[PDB]
Enzyme design. Structure first.
Site, PDB file in Angstrom:
ATOM      1  N   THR A  28      14.887 -64.692  25.712  1.00  0.00           N
ATOM      2  CA  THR A  28      15.702 -64.864  26.910  1.00  0.00           C
ATOM      3  C   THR A  28      15.275 -66.160  27.590  1.00  0.00           C
ATOM      4  O   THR A  28      14.152 -66.259  28.093  1.00  0.00           O
ATOM      5  CB  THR A  28      15.548 -63.663  27.843  1.00  0.00           C
ATOM      6  OG1 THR A  28      15.968 -62.475  27.161  1.00  0.00           O
ATOM      7  CG2 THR A  28      16.389 -63.829  29.076  1.00  0.00           C
ATOM      8  N   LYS A 140       8.545 -60.325  20.746  1.00  0.00           N
ATOM      9  CA  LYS A 140       9.632 -59.801  21.575  1.00  0.00           C
ATOM     10  C   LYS A 140      10.709 -59.170  20.687  1.00  0.00           C
ATOM     11  O   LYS A 140      11.864 -59.601  20.647  1.00  0.00           O
ATOM     12  CB  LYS A 140      10.202 -60.915  22.442  1.00  0.00           C
ATOM     13  CG  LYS A 140      11.082 -60.485  23.612  1.00  0.00           C
ATOM     14  CD  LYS A 140      11.598 -61.735  24.328  1.00  0.00           C
ATOM     15  CE  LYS A 140      12.090 -61.458  25.740  1.00  0.00           C
ATOM     16  NZ  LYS A 140      10.995 -61.614  26.735  1.00  0.00           N
ATOM     17  N   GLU A 173       0.239 -55.834  30.051  1.00  0.00           N
ATOM     18  CA  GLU A 173       1.274 -56.679  30.635  1.00  0.00           C
ATOM     19  C   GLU A 173       1.943 -55.884  31.746  1.00  0.00           C
ATOM     20  O   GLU A 173       1.459 -54.822  32.152  1.00  0.00           O
ATOM     21  CB  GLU A 173       2.286 -57.144  29.570  1.00  0.00           C
ATOM     22  CG  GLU A 173       3.034 -56.010  28.862  1.00  0.00           C
ATOM     23  CD  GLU A 173       4.083 -56.482  27.831  1.00  0.00           C
ATOM     24  OE1 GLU A 173       4.249 -57.708  27.610  1.00  0.00           O
ATOM     25  OE2 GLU A 173       4.760 -55.600  27.244  1.00  0.00           O
TER      26      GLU A 173
END
Ligand code: CL
Ligand code: CL
Ligand code: CL
Lengths: 269, 270
Positions: A28, A140, A173
């Site tokens: 993204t 990802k 995270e």
């Protein structure tokens, strides 16, 4: 509308293994004045993901062209790119599997980042952990049900983002971002060899902290280290960086780390 | 390649669907015998439990049963796959203001290789790929199956037919596409699936039969040494439905006592 293998098209074959198994990955990227920020890092992340997932992909030159042509025209936007293994195979097997699938779309840049960036946001400890697997760590990839559940549990509270542990109790995270914390002159960030996404903004901050007034350590830490930190920040390719003003009741006033990184990150390149 | 998507005969799905974006849903794969769906009720139950555990609102259960039974009638053999996903919408990972759930159904042909597997027994190999531990996803046949894709990929670099799969802490959990049971003497063991793996329709059916059996049963947390030292190993899923292991780690496994007790129940259309 979407661009799928070069065709304007908003529907994909049901048999595609992104739909069946989440068999692929994505990135993204932020659009600023018609250009894609960190375009080379985004292509890099996609290439590393395809390699680690054994997804053969040939059209890197072509994909670079498609990404830049979709970004031109938007002063402010979000470009999402998905690369899946395509359709085919027998069950989980990918033998005799047809060529990979690339899926591009431009979306609207959210406005709530500005309010977050100025006032700071609140952290809460997610009850949902991350599974540990070094074959998928850092990527990802499309298997994002854990973040979906994390976001769902986070929405039952008044906090803006979640602090996320792995299955053994180690800070990894946030829900949709990487995190750094600082105590004194030392900046910490979790090592992502077992879980989490090795973000483009995370790699960028480490590259700048390597010549800075801070020492840097990739650590394996309990949530207490975060609670006892002087300062916490989170980052992803879109925010690009947000400070934490509160976590677990204690208040975080210092902005020293944030003020060093903000001019680097928020210069969109 | 034609599917039934929300009751409509289509070969394509909206790219926005969160199955395609995040694997945001679950599935089930059922065997068809003589136009009947085997263990039909157990398949609806597993989908229902998964939807509740993933917080996916889905209200069309009777409509879904009718569509399942419609696509299955007239097939002497077949494989019925059903996917229920959260649908399209939401901002990023968030599911707020999310549009209606998607149901996807299709029927494909029953593979002939199960018969030769069932007759000759198959070989196992220890997979280097582990399963992440997460009690919020454990037991569900959810769509986040990338781990199973890597396991099969690494399995295809060997000569073995299936893989023994451990979780990230080294505990025996399952195979690549099947649950497993092993036996030593009169005791039958199977891994507890509270941290990872899929709690299969067929694993649950075997557990019911083994409660009326000449075997003791234990769900355990065991290392791979327990498997290598067992007298007998079998694997199961909805389609096989039960396959004997003839070899693992160079050891030969000849006994079929557990297989011969479970197979008459399993190889009966329910
Ligand atoms: Cl993101
Ligand atoms: Cl379960
Ligand atoms: Cl299966």
């Amino acid at each position: 509308m979407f661009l799928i293998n070069g065709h304007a098209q908003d529907q994909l074959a049901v048999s595609d293994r992104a739909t069946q198994f989440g068999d692929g990955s994505f990135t993204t990227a932020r659009i600023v004045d018609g250009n894609i920020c960190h375009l080379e890092a985004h292509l890099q992340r996609l290439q590393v993901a395809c390699e680690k997932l054994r997804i053969a992909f040939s059209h890197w030159s072509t994909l670079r062209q498609e990404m830049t042509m979709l970004a031109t025209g938007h002063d402010s936007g979000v470009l999402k790119v998905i690369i899946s293994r395509g359709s085919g195979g027998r069950g989980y097997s990918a033998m005799n599997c047809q060529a990979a699938t690339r899926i591009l779309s431009v979306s609207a840049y959210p406005a709530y980042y500005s309010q977050w960036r100025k006032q700071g946001i609140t952290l809460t400890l997610s009850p949902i952990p991350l599974g540990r697997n070094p074959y998928l760590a850092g990527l990802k990839h499309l298997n994002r049900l854990e973040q979906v559940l994390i976001r769902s549990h986070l929405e039952q509270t008044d906090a803006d983002e979640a602090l996320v542990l792995d299955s053994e109790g180690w800070v990894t995270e946030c829900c949709a971002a990487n995190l750094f914390w600082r105590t004194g002159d030392i900046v910490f960030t979790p090592r992502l060899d077992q879980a989490g996404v090795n973000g483009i903004m995370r790699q960028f901050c480490l590259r700048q902290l390597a010549q800075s007034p801070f020492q840097v350590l990739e650590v394996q830490a309990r949530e207490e280290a975060v609670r006892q930190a002087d300062e916490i920040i989170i980052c992803n390719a879109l925010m690009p960086i947000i400070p934490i003003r509160a976590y677990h009741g204690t208040s975080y006033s210092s902005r020293t780390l944030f003020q060093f990184l903000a001019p680097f990150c928020e210069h969109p390149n």
